[PDB]
PDB file of C-alpha atoms and ligand atoms in Angstrom:
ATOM      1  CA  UNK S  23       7.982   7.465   8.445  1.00  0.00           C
ATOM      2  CA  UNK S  24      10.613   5.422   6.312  1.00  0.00           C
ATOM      3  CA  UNK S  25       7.471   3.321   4.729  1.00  0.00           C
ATOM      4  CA  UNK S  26       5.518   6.629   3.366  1.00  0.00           C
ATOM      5  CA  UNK S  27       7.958   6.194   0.736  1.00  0.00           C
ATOM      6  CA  UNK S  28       7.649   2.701  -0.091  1.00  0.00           C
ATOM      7  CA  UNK S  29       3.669   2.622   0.088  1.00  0.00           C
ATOM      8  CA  UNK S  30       2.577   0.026  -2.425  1.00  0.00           C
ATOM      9  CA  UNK S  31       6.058  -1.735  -2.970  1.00  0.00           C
ATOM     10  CA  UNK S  32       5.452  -3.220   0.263  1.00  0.00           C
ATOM     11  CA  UNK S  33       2.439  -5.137  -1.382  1.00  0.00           C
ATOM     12  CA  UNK S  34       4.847  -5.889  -4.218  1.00  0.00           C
ATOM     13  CA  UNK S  35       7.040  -7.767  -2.456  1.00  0.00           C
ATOM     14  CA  UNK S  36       4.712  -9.537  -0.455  1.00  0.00           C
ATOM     15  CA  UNK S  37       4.011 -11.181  -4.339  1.00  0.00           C
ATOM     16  CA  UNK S  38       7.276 -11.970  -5.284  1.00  0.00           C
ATOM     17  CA  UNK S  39       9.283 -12.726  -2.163  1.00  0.00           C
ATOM     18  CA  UNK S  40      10.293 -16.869  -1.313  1.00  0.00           C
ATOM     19  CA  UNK S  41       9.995 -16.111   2.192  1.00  0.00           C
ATOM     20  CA  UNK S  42       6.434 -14.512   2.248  1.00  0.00           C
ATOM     21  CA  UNK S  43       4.739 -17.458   2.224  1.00  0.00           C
ATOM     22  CA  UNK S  44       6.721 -19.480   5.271  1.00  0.00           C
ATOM     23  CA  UNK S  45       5.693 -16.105   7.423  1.00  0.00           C
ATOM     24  CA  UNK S  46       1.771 -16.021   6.315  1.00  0.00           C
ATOM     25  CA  UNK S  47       1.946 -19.962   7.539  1.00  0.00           C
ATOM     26  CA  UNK S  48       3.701 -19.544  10.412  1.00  0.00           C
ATOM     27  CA  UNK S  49       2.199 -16.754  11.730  1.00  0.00           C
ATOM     28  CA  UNK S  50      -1.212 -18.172  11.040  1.00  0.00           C
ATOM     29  CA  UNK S  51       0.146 -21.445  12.728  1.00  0.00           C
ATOM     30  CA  UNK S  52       1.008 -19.571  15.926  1.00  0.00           C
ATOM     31  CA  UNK S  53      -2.484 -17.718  16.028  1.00  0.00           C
ATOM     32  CA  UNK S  54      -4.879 -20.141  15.672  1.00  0.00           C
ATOM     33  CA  UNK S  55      -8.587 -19.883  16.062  1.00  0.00           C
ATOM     34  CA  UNK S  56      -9.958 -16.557  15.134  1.00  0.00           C
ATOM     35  CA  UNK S  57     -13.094 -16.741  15.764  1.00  0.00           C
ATOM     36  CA  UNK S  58     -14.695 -13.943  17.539  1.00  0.00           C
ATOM     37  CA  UNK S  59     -12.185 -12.688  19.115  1.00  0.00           C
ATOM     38  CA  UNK S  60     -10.911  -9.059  18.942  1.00  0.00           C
ATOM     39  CA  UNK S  61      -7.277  -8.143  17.250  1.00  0.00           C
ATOM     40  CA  UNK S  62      -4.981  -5.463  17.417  1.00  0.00           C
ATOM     41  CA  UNK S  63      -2.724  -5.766  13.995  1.00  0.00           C
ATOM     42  CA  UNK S  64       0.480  -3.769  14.902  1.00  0.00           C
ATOM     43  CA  UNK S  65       2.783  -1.760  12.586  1.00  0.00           C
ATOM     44  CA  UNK S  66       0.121  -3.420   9.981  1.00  0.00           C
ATOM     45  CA  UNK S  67       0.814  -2.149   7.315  1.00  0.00           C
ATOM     46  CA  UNK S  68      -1.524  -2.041   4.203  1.00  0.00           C
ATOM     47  CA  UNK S  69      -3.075  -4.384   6.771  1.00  0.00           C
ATOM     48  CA  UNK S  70      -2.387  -7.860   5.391  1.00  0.00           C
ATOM     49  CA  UNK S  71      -2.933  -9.533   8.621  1.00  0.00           C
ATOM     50  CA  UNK S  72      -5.587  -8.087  10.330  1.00  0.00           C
ATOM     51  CA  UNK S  73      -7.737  -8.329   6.837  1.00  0.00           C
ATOM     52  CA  UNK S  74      -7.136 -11.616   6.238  1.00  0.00           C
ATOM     53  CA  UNK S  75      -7.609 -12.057  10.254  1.00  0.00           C
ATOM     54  CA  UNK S  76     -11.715 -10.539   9.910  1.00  0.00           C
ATOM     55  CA  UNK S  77     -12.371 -12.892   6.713  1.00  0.00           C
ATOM     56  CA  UNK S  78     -10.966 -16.154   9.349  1.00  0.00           C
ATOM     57  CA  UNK S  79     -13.984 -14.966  11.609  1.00  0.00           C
ATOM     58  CA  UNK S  80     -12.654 -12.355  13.994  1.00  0.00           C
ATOM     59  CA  UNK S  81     -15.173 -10.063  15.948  1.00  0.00           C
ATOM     60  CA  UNK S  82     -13.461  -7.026  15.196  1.00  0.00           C
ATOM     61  CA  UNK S  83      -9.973  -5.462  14.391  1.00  0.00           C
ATOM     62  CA  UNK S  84      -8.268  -2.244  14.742  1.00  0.00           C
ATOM     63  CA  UNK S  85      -4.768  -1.520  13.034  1.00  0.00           C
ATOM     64  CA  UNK S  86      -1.896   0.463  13.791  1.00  0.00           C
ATOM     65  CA  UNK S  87       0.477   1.851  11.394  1.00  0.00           C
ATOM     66  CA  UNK S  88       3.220   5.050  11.807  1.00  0.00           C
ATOM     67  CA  UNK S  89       3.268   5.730   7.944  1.00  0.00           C
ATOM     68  CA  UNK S  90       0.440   7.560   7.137  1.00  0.00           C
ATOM     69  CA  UNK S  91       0.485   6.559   3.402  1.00  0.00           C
ATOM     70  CA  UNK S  92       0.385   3.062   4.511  1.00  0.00           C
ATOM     71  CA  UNK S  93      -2.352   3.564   6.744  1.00  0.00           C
ATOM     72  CA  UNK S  94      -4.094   5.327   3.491  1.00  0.00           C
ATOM     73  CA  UNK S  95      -3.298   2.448   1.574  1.00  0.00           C
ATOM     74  CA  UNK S  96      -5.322   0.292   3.972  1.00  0.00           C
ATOM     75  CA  UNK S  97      -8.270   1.922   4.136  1.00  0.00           C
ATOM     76  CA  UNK S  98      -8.568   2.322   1.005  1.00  0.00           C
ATOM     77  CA  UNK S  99      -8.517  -1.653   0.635  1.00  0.00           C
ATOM     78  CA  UNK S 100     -11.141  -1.710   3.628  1.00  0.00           C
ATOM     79  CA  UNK S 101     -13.305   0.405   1.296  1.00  0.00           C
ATOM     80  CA  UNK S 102     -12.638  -1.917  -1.914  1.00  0.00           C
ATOM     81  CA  UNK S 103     -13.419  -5.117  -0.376  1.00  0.00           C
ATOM     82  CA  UNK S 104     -15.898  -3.548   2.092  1.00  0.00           C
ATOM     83  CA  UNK S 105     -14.342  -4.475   5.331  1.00  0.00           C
ATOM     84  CA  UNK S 106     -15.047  -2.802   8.954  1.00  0.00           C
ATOM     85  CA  UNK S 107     -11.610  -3.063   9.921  1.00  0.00           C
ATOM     86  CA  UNK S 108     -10.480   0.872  11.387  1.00  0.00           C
ATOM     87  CA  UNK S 109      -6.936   1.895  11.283  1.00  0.00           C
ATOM     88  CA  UNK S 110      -4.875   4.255  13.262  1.00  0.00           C
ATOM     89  CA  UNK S 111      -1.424   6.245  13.167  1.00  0.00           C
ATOM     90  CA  UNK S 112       0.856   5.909  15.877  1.00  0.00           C
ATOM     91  CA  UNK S 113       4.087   4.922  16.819  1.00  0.00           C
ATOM     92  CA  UNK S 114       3.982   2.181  18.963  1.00  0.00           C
ATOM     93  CA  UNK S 115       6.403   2.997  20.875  1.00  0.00           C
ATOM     94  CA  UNK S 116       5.199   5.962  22.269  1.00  0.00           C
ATOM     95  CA  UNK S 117       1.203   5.484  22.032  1.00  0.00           C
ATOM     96  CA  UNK S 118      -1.881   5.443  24.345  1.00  0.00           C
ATOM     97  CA  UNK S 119      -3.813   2.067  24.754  1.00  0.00           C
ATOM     98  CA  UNK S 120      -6.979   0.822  22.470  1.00  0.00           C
ATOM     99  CA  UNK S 121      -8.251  -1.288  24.547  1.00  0.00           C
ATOM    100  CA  UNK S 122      -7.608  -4.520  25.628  1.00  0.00           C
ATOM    101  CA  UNK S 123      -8.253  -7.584  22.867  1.00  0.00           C
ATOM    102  CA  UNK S 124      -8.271 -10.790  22.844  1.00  0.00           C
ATOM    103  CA  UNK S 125      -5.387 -11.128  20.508  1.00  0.00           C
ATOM    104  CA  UNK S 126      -2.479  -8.614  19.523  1.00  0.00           C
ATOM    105  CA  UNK S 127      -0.903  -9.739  16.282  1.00  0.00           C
ATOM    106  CA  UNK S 128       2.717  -7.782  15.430  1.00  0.00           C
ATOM    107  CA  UNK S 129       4.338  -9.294  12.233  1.00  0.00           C
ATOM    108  CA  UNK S 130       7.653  -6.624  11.416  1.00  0.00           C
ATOM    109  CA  UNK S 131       7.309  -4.775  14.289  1.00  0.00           C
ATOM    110  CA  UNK S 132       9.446  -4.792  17.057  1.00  0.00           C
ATOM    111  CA  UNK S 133      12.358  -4.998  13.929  1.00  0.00           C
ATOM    112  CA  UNK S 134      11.414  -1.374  14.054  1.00  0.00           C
ATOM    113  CA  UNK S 135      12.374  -0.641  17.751  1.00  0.00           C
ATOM    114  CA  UNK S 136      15.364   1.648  17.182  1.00  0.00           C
ATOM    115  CA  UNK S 137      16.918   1.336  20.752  1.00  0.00           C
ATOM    116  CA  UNK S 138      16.462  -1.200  23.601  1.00  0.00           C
ATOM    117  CA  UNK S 139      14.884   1.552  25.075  1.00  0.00           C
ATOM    118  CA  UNK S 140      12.219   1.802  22.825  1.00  0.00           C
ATOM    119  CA  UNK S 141      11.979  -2.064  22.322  1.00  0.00           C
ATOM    120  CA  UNK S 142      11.315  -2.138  25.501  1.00  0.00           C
ATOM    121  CA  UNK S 143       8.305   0.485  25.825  1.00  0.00           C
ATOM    122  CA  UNK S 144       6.557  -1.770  22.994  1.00  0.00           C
ATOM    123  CA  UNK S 145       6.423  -4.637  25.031  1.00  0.00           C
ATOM    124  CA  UNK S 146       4.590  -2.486  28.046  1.00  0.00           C
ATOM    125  CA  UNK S 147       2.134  -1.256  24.973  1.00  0.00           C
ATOM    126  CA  UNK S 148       1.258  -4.430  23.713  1.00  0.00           C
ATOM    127  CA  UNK S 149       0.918  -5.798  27.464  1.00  0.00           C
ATOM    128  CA  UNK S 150      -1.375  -2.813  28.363  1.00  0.00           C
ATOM    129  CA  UNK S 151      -3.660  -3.699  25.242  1.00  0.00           C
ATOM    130  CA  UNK S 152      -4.156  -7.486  25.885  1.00  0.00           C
ATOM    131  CA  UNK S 153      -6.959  -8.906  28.352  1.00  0.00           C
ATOM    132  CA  UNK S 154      -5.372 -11.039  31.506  1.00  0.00           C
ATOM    133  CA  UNK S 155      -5.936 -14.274  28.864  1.00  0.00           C
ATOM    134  CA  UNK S 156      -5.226 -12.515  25.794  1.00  0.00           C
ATOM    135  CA  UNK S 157      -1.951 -13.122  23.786  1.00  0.00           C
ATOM    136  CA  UNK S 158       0.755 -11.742  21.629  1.00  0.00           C
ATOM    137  CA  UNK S 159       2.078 -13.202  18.104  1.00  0.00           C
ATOM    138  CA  UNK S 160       4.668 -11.643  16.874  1.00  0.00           C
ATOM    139  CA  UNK S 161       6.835 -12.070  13.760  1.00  0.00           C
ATOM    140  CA  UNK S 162      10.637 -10.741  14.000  1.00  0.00           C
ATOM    141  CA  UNK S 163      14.508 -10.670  12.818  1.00  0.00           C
ATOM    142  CA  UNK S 164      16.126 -13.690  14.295  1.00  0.00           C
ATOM    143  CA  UNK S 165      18.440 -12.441  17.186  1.00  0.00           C
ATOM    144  CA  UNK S 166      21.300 -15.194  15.790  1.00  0.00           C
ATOM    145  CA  UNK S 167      21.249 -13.591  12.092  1.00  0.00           C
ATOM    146  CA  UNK S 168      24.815 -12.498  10.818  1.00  0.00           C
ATOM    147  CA  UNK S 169      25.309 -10.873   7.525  1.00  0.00           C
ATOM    148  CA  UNK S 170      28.697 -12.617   7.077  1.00  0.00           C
ATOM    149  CA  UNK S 171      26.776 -16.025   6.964  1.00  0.00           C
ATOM    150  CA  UNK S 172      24.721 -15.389   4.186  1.00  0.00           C
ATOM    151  CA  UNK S 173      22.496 -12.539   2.642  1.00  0.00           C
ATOM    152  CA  UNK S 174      18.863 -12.905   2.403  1.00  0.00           C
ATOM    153  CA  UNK S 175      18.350 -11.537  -1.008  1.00  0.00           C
ATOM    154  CA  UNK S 176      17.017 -14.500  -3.021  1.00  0.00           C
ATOM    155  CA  UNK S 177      14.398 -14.773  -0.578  1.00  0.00           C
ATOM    156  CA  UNK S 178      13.407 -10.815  -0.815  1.00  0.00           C
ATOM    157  CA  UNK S 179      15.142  -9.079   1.618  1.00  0.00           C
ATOM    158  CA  UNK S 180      18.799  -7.703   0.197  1.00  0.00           C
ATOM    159  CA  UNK S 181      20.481  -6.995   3.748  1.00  0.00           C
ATOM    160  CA  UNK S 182      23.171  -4.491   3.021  1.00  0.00           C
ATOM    161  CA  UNK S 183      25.099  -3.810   5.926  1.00  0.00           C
ATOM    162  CA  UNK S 184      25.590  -4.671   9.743  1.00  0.00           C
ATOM    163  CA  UNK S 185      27.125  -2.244  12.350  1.00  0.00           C
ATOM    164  CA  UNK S 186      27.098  -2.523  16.023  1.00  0.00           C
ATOM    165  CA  UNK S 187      23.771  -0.192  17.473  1.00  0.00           C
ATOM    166  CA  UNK S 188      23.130   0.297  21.414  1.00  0.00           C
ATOM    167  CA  UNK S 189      23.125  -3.521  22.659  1.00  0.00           C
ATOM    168  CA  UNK S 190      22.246  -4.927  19.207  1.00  0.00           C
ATOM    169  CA  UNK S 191      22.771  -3.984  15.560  1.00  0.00           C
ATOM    170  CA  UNK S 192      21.655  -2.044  12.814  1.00  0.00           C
ATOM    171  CA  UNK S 193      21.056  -3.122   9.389  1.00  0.00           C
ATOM    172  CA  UNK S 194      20.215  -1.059   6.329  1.00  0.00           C
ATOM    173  CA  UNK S 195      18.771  -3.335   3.592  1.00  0.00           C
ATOM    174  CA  UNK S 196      16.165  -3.132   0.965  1.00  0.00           C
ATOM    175  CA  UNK S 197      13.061  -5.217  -0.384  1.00  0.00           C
ATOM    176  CA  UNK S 198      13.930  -6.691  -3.793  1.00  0.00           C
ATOM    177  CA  UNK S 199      10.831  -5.002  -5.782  1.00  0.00           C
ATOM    178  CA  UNK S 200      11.231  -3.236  -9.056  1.00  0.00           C
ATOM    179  CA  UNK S 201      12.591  -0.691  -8.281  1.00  0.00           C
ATOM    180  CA  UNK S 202      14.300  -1.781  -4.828  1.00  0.00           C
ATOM    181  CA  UNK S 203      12.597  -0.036  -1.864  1.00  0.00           C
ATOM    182  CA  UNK S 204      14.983   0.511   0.340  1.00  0.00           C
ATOM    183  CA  UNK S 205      15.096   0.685   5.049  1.00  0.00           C
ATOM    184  CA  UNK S 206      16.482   0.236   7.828  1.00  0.00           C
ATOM    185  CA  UNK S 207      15.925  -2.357  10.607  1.00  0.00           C
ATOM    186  CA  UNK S 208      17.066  -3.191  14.276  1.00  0.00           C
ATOM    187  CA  UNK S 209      18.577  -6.864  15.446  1.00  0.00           C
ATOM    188  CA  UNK S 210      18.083  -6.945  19.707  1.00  0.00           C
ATOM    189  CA  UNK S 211      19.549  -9.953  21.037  1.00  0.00           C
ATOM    190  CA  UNK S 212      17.489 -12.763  22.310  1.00  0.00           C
ATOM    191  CA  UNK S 213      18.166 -11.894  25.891  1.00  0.00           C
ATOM    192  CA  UNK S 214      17.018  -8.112  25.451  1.00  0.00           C
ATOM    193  CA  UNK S 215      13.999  -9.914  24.158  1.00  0.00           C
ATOM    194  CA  UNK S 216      13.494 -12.065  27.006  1.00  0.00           C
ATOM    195  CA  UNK S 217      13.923  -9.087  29.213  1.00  0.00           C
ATOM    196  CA  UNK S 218      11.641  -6.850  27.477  1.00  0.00           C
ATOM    197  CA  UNK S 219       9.320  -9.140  27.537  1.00  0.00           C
ATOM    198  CA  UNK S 220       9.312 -10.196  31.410  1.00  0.00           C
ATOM    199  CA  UNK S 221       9.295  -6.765  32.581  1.00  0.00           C
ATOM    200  CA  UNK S 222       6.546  -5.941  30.315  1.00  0.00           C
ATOM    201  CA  UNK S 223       4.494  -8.718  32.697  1.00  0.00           C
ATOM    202  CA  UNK S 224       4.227 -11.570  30.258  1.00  0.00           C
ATOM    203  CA  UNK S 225       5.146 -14.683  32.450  1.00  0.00           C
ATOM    204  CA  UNK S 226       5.025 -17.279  29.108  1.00  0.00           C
ATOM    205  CA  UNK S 227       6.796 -16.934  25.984  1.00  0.00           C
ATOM    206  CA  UNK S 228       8.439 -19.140  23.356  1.00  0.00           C
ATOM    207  CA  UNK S 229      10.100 -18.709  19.864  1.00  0.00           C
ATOM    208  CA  UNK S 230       8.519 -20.158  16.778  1.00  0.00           C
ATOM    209  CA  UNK S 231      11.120 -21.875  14.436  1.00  0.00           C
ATOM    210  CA  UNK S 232       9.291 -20.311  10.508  1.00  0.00           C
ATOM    211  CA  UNK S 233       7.302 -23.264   8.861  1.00  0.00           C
ATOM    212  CA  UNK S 234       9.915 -24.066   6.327  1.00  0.00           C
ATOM    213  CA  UNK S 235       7.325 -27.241   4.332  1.00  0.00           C
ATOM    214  CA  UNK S 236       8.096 -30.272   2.345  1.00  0.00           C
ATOM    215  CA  UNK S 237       6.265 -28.687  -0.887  1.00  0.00           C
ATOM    216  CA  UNK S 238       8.910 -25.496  -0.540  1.00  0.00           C
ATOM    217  CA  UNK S 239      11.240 -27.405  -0.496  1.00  0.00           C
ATOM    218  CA  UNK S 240      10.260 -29.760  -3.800  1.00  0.00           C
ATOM    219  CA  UNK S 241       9.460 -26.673  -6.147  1.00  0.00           C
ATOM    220  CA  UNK S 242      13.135 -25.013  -5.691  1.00  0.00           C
ATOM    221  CA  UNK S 243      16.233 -27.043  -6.768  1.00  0.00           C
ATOM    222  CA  UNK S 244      18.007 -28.797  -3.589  1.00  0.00           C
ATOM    223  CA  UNK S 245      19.841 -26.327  -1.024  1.00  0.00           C
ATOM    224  CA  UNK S 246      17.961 -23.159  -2.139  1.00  0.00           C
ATOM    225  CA  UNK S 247      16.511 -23.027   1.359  1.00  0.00           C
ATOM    226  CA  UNK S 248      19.952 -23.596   2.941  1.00  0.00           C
ATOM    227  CA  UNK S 249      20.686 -20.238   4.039  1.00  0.00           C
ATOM    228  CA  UNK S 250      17.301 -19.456   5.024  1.00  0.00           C
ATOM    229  CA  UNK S 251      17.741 -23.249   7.494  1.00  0.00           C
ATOM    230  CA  UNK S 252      21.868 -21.562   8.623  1.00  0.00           C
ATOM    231  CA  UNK S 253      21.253 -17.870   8.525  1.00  0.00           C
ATOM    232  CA  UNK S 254      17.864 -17.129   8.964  1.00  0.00           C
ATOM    233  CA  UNK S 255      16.600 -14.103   9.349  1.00  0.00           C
ATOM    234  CA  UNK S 256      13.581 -14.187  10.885  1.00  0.00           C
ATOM    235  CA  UNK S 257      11.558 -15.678  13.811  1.00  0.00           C
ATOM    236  CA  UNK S 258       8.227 -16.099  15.158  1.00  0.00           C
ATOM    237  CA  UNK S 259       7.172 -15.319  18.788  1.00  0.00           C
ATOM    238  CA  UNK S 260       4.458 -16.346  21.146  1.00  0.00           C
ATOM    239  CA  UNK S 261       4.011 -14.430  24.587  1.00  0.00           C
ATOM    240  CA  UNK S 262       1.024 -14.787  27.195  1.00  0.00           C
ATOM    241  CA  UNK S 263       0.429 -12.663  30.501  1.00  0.00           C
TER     242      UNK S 263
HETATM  243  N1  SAH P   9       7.213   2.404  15.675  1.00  0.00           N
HETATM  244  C1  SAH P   9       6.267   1.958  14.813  1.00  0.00           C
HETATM  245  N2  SAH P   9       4.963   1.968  15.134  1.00  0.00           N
HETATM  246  C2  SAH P   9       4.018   1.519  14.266  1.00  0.00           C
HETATM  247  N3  SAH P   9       4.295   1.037  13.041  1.00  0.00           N
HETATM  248  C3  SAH P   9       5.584   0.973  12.601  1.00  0.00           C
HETATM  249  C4  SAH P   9       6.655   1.443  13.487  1.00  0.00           C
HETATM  250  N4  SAH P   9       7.804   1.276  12.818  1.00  0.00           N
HETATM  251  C5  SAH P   9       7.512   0.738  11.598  1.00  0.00           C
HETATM  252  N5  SAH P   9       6.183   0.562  11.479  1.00  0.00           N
HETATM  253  C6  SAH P   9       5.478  -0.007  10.308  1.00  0.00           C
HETATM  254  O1  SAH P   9       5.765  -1.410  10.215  1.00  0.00           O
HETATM  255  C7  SAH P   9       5.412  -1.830   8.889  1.00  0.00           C
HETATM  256  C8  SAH P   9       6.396  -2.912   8.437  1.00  0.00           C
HETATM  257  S1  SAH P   9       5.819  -3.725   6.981  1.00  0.00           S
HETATM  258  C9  SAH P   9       4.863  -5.068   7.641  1.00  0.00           C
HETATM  259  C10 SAH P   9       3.397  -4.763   7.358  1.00  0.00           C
HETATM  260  C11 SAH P   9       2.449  -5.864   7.840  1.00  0.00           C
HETATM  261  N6  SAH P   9       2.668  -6.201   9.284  1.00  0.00           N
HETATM  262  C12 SAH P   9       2.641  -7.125   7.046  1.00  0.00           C
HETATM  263  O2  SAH P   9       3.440  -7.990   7.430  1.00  0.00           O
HETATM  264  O3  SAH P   9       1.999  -7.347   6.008  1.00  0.00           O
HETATM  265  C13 SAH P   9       5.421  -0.568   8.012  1.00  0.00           C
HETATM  266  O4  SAH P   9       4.086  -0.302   7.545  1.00  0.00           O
HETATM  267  C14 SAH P   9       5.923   0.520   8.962  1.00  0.00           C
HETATM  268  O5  SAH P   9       5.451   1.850   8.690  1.00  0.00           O
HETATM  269  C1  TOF P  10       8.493  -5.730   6.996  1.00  0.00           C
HETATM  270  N1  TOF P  10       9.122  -6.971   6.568  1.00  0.00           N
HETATM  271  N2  TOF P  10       8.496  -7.828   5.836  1.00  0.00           N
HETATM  272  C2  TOF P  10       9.070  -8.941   5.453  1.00  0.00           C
HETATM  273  N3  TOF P  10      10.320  -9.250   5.777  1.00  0.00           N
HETATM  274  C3  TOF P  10      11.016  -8.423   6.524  1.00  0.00           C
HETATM  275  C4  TOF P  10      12.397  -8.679   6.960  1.00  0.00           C
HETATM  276  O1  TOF P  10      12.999  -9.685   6.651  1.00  0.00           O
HETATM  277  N4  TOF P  10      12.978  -7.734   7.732  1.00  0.00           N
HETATM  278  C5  TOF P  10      14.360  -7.933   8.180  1.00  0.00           C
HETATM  279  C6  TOF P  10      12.313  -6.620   8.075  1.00  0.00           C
HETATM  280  O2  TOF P  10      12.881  -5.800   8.770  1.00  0.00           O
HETATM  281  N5  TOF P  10      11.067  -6.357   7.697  1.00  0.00           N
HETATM  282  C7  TOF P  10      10.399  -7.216   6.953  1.00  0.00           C
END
């Protein structure tokens, strides 16, 4: 797993990065009330989400994470702040259903998908773990990014390269930490989306513009957010059965 050797860097740049704090608000937007519901927190990470989900008022939440040194790292945060959250290690892509919850939350995974294929086969996982009136929100690379319009590295995310991969593209790139952390990410097209996600079964869906806010824009000086308004490179996502 390309994040066993990143481990707490990840955290790092959750602290430093611009963007960070547009995808905590938007995602948070796009899931709304919490309370007492159960939540699946996908590819989660040192489990950011589904932590910060449980304090909100959630019933109970499970994570899922392919690096086993991040899934380390989150228990061992469960056990600092004593939280009941439980994690997991699987690949998404390939793994047997949890159950089905009320709410599945992915933030940076489907990014991960490294053929359509396999994009694909998350959608029918998530499906399979959400109840008939359950939903998805999900937190992705913007289908309409293009390196040659503007790197991303001011905001955290140095994007080093672009080449063509299956239907989409690949893109090596790195976190801007100290020292840089460096992976690898996929960029499916918004119809491969759209079609992953309709075979899959979910009937509903919309994108989620990020919640770029007045007060962002007032503490950096004017057009710092421009490329992040003409080039971003990320999205949110919404999808009910
Ligand atoms: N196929 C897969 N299945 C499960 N997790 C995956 C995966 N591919 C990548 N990941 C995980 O996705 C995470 C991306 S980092 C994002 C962490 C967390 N969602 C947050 O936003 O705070 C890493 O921990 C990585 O190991
Ligand atoms: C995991 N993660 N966190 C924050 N930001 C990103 C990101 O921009 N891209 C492109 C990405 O693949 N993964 C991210």
């Amino acid at each position: 797993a390309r994040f066993d050797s990143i481990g707490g860097l990840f955290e790092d740049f959750t602290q430093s990065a611009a963007q960070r704090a547009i995808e905590v608000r938007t995602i948070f937007h796009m899931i709304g009330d919490v309370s007492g519901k159960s939540v699946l927190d996908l590819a989660c990470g040192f489990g950011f989400f589904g932590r910060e989900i449980y304090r909100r008022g959630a019933a109970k939440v499970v994570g899922v994470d392919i690096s086993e040194k991040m899934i380390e790292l989150a228990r061992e945060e469960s056990r600092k702040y004593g939280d009941p959250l439980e994690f997991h290690v699987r690949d998404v892509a390939n793994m047997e259903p949890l159950g089905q919850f009320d709410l599945v939350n992915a933030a940076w995974l489907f990014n991960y998908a490294d053929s359509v294929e396999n994009l694909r086969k998350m959608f029918k996982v998530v499906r399979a773990s959400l109840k008939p009136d359950g939903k998805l929100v999900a937190y992705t690379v913007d289908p309409d990014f293009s390196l040659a319009k503007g790197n991303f590295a001011k905001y955290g995310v140095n994007v080093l390269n672009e080449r063509a991969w299956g239907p989409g593209y690949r893109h090596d790139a790195e976190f801007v930490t100290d020292p840089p952390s460096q992976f690898s990410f996929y960029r499916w097209s918004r119809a491969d989306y759209e079609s992953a996600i309709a075979d899959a079964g979910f009937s509903h869906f919309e994108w989620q513009k990020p919640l770029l806010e007045a007060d962002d824009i007032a503490t950096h000086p004017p057009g710092f957010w421009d490329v992040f308004q003409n080039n971003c490179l990320q999205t949110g996502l919404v999808c009910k059965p």
